[PDB]
């Protein structure tokens, strides 16, 4: 009837959901370390501190990803730099609460309307909330979401030494998502629609990742201190 998932694909799905659940929540030991590095500046600190912790969890998830060892060190950093901001948009949008129309991060102190308005970035949260509501309407399970995360990481980025290699790795996750949607929907015609709307998220997170790069430059112009780990992972220029 429907082409089933192979043993390699069923194990890959089980591996991705296993580790993505371990990095959903930051470590309590690493929670207090990133805060000791550096008028209240408290809303801006909580948003950045949670971003540092979550980005650190994204890198650990990406390093233990099948295929990440096959690429060179220069290509690993290129993929980690680019996917950091975009996967951040997926991590936050994954915690969208429909009832309260907000982001519930258990901590629930960083990604709030109040902290973004006090930090001067009141316009940004509405663009983020729109992506949260759009992605929430898709009703992706943890398999769609985890496979999508891997597809974001192995996307074709500018400045890659071996683009044809990363493309083969990405196709290895795309076909896993394609067959999973096929068995999930019993090869219904809507399988391409569900597979197409998921691939559409790749396009939209490009814009959010671009908004983050413009915001980091605007914060550097207004002499607001961005954490060093976020300035290096996103190549934020020390602009005047």
């Amino acid at each position: 009837n429907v082409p089933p998932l192979t043993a390699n694909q069923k194990s890959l799905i089980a591996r991705l959901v296993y580790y993505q659940e371990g990095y959903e929540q930051p470590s309590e030991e690493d929670l207090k370390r990133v805060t000791q590095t550096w008028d209240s500046d408290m809303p801006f600190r909580q948003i950045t501190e949670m971003t540092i912790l979550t980005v650190q969890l994204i890198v650990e998830f990406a390093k233990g990803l099948p295929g990440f060892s096959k690429i060179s060190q220069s290509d690993q950093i290129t993929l980690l730099k680019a996917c950091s901001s975009e996967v951040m948009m997926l991590r936050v949008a994954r915690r969208y609460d429909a009832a309260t129309d907000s982001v519930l991060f258990a901590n629930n102190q960083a990604y709030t309307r109040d902290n973004y308005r006090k930090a001067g970035m009141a316009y940004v949260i509405e663009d983020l909330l729109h992506f949260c509501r759009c992605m929430y309407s898709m009703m992706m399970d943890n398999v769609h979401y985890a496979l999508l995360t891997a597809i974001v990481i192995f996307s074709d980025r500018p400045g890659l030494e071996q683009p044809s290699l990363v493309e083969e790795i990405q196709r290895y996750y795309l076909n896993t998502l394609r067959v999973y949607i096929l068995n999930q929907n019993s090869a219904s015609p809507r399988s391409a629609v569900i597979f197409g709307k998921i691939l559409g998220i790749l396009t939209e997170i490009r814009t959010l990742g671009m908004q983050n790069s413009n915001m980091c430059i605007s914060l550097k112009l207004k002499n607001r201190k961005l954490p060093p780990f976020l300035e290096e992972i996103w190549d934020v220029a020390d602009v005047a």
Binding site: F131, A192, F195, G196, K197, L199, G200
Partner: protein
């Protein structure tokens, strides 16, 4: 009442619009940071873009079930797609000017009568966008062997974006894009049955087109070449007042 299909979209490519009414989507404007020596060329290129933006609105208007959308939503879909659809058309035309099948490509087809040379883009500081258009889009679609059926289907998927901010009836836009996903998967499965990752391979060009389109806006806004305050009104007047497209029999 007609069906939104690849066959109908292919017939819409033959229709030529009469750009008797011109709207200044892209203009140089006063106190332009563009050097005066190159100000007349940039203005010429802006008028060419405006002509192709006008033909783009006439094309979107005749897409099946697009007119049945709310006029507010028709403006928002064209407002958020004209730049990406322009670059996608430029890359499609630029496939003919490719080198061979180690020097980077040098020609880019702005319009049937136009080729922008790579050295001119380097002087304008847009050489990085110039190469990404020819590599990530033009050369990749040549490698993917994209035909006109898949090209015009991707155009509709770019336009019919339900994630456009401010839409009145989001789900009305969804049904159209969801229908284009079905039309695209069916064409890929019956034509190239061996290629099973082609449906994703074609759609993977849209995120690349987005990153290039957003980077073009950064240069466009840096030189104050866009009139974003009047673009929404131009599309409204173009949807109502522009003449129907001319047909080639």
């Amino acid at each position: 009442v007609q069906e939104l299909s690849i066959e109908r979209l292919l017939e819409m490519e033959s229709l030529v619009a009469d750009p008797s009414e011109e709207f200044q989507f892209l203009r140089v404007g006063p106190d332009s940071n563009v050097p005066p020596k190159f100000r007349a060329p940039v203005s010429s290129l802006c008028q060419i873009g405006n002509k192709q933006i006008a033909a783009l609105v006439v094309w979107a208007r005749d897409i099946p079930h697009f007119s049945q959308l709310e006029m507010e939503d028709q403006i928002l879909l064209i407002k958020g797609s004209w730049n990406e659809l322009l670059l996608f058309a430029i890359a499609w035309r630029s496939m003919e000017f490719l080198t061979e099948e180690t020097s980077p490509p040098q020609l880019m087809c702005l319009m049937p009568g136009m080729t922008l040379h790579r050295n001119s883009a380097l002087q304008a500081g847009v050489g990085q966008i110039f190469d990404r258009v020819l590599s990530e889009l033009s050369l990749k679609m040549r490698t993917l062997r994209v035909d006109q059926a898949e090209y015009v289907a991707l155009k509709a998927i770019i336009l019919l974006n339900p994630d456009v901010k401010g839409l009145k009836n989001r789900q009305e836009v969804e049904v159209l894009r969801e229908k284009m996903f079905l039309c695209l998967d069916e064409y890929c499965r019956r034509s190239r049955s061996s290629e099973e990752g082609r449906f994703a391979a074609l759609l993977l060009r849209l995120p690349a087109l987005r990153s290039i389109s957003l980077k073009s806006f950064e240069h466009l806004f840096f030189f104050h070449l866009v009139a974003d305050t009047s673009i929404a009104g131009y599309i409204r007047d173009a949807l109502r007042n522009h003449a129907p497209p001319i047909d080639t029999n």
